Amino acid sequence: SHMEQTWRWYGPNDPVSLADVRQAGATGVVTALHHIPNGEVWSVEEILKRKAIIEDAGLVWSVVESVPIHEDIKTHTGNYEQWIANYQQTLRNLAQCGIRTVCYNFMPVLDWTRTDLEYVLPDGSKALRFDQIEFAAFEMHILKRPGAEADYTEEEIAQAAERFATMSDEDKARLTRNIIAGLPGAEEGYTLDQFRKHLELYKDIDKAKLRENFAVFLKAIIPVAEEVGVRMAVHPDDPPRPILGLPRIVSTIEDMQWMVDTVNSMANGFTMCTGSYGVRADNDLVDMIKQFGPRIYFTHLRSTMREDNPKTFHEAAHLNGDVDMYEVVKAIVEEEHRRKAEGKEDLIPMRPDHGHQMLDDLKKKTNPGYSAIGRLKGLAEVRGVELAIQRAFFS
Ligand SMILES: [Cl-]
Ligand SMILES: [Mn+2]
């Protein structure tokens, strides 16, 4: 109702139109210049072009998701210094164009990851799924990573071998593409061989080293963001665990603390993605929001559901997953009101993030799962929750 409601739109080629976005009840658009090569400067011309198209539809461009971080920066090799300078200039250009919140991530090699993009739920809608056994089967029988076995239980290893033996040729190829070709919003994509040799760049990069590399990026980027009035909002790892023998360092409350300890500036902030942090039961989403609320500049309000094997999860309906959406939204609302009591008024933009593929969208080739109807539904659900919290607690 007064909640800042935003919606990820991929641009002119997105099958979801800006008219769909408005009718969904979003007033803001989340987007990026996906056609601009990784690490290159986003020009004022290109930024203003996307901005104009959005304003044309009676919308505003609210949040950038994402400005991609080149792999050279993550490995601290090659042309990292130039890429950093370009990132800095991109932020200057964005700010000069009046776009002041930037979502980004530091997931190395792979971005957000699923094994199944067409998982049929009991109601017939399709969800995204990370099947731990499918993922083990890929790692040990397709990628054949030495020695991936350490990441798994004896039971999971046995189940993987069995799942792999039931897979058709096409099952194996589709599983592979699902994991490495890049899901919607990802700025990296690989063939199996490209992927395998890219992994080698990380043989001596452990959690501590990757943090060092991230610190270099942050200490260079944040003062620029602060100088120009842009706020940075880091997106968590998805899933928030170390996969493929690579570290993942934006997964827990300790990682959040590490980022604040590393760069104190308030320009160094967070995207509270409840779908990603909520994958693992030991993340206390409400406490995360209570402790880091002043630095939360963007939220993704969706839910996953852990299955019998707690590392297996699929995307749930927004109000029916592991995320206690009531408590999460209450905490966000409480944070917005404490800003207002500090004499400010600084709303936290949200987007529904992912939705199930349902109704008319089932007959379509969609961006997984950035179909419109399921995301409209999640947005409507959270809108209702937030409105009632506002009235129950802040009227
Ligand atoms: Cl969205
Ligand atoms: Mn998210």
| Domain spans of the chain, in order of start | 1-104+201-301+320-353+373-395, 105-200+302-319+354-372
Are 361 and 374 in contact by the 8 Å Cβ rule? The answer is yes
- CA 351–ligand 2 middle distance (angstroms): 9
Indicate if 152 belongs to the active site.
Answer: no
Residue 361: both structure tokens together: 């969208």
Which residue out of 151, 190, 300, 322 is catalytically annotated? 300
Q: Which two tokens stand for residue 15?
A: 């099958």
CB burial of 114-148 (b: ≥16 within 10 Å; e: otherwise) equals bbbbebebeeebbbbbbbbbbbbbbbbbbbeeeeb
Is residue 283 within 8 A of residue 273, CB to CB? The reply is no
309's CB contacts (< 8 A; 6+ apart) are 132, 133, 156
Order of strands across the sheet that contains 350-351:
6-8, 28-31, 60-65, 101-104, 231-234, 268-273, 296-300, 350-351
Structure tokens given for 25:
């009840």
Residue 175: how many other CB atoms lie within 10 Å: 22
Angle 246-251-256 (CA atoms, 0-180°, nearest 5)?
Answer: 125
Residue 211 and residue 258: Cα distance in Å, rounded?
A: 9
Residues 6+ apart with CB under 8 A from 39: 68, 70, 72, 79, 82, 83, 86, 87
Specify the CATH class of 1-104+201-301+320-353+373-395 in words. alpha beta
Question: Which experimental technique did the depositors report for determining this structure?
Answer: X-ray
68: which 2 tokens? 């991609």
- Tell me, in Å, the resolution of the deposited structure: 2.3
What distance in Å separates the CA atoms of residue 102 and residue 65, rounded to the nearest whole number? 6
Helix, coil or strand: residue 351: strand
Among this protein's residues, is 337 annotated catalytic?
A: no
Please state, in angstroms and as integers, the Cα–Cα distance from residue 54 to each residue in 27, 51, 147, 224, 315, following that order: 10, 5, 48, 26, 29
Instruction: Provide the b/e sequence for 359-372 (b: ≥16 CB within 10 Å).
Output: eebeeeebbbbbbb
Report d(CA 29, CA 54) in Å as an integer: 7
> 271 pairs with which residues across the strands?
298
Distance CA 39, CA 104 (A): 13
User: What is the CA(273)–ligand 2 centre distance, in A?
Assistant: 4
Active site residue 202: no
Bridging pattern class, strands 268-273 and 296-300: parallel
Dist CA 393 CA 395 (whole Å): 6
- Tell me, rounded to whole angstroms, the distance of Cα 236 from its chain centroid: 6
Q: Which residues contact 385 (CB under 8 A, 6 or more apart)?
A: 319, 325, 326, 329
76 as an active site residue: the answer is no
DSSP string, 71-84: HHHHHT-TTHHHHH
Name 138's Cβ contacts closer than 8 Å, sequence gap at least 6.
Answer: 115, 175, 176, 179
How far is 182 from 187, CA to CA, in rounded Å? Answer: 7
Going from the Cα of 161 to the center of ligand 2, the distance in angstroms, rounded, reads: 32
Distance between CA atoms of residues 63 and 380, nearest Å = 20
Question: Which ligand sits nearest to residue 300's alpha carbon?
Answer: 2
239-255 b/e (C-beta count within 10 Å ≥ 16 → b): bbebbbbbbbbbbbbeb
Residue 353 among the catalytic residues: yes
What's the rounded Cα separation, in Å, for the pair 271 and 201? 28
* Tokens encoding 40: 């290159």
- Those residues whose C-beta lies under 8 Å from the C-beta of residue 16, and which sit 6 or more positions away, are 9, 10, 370, 371, 372
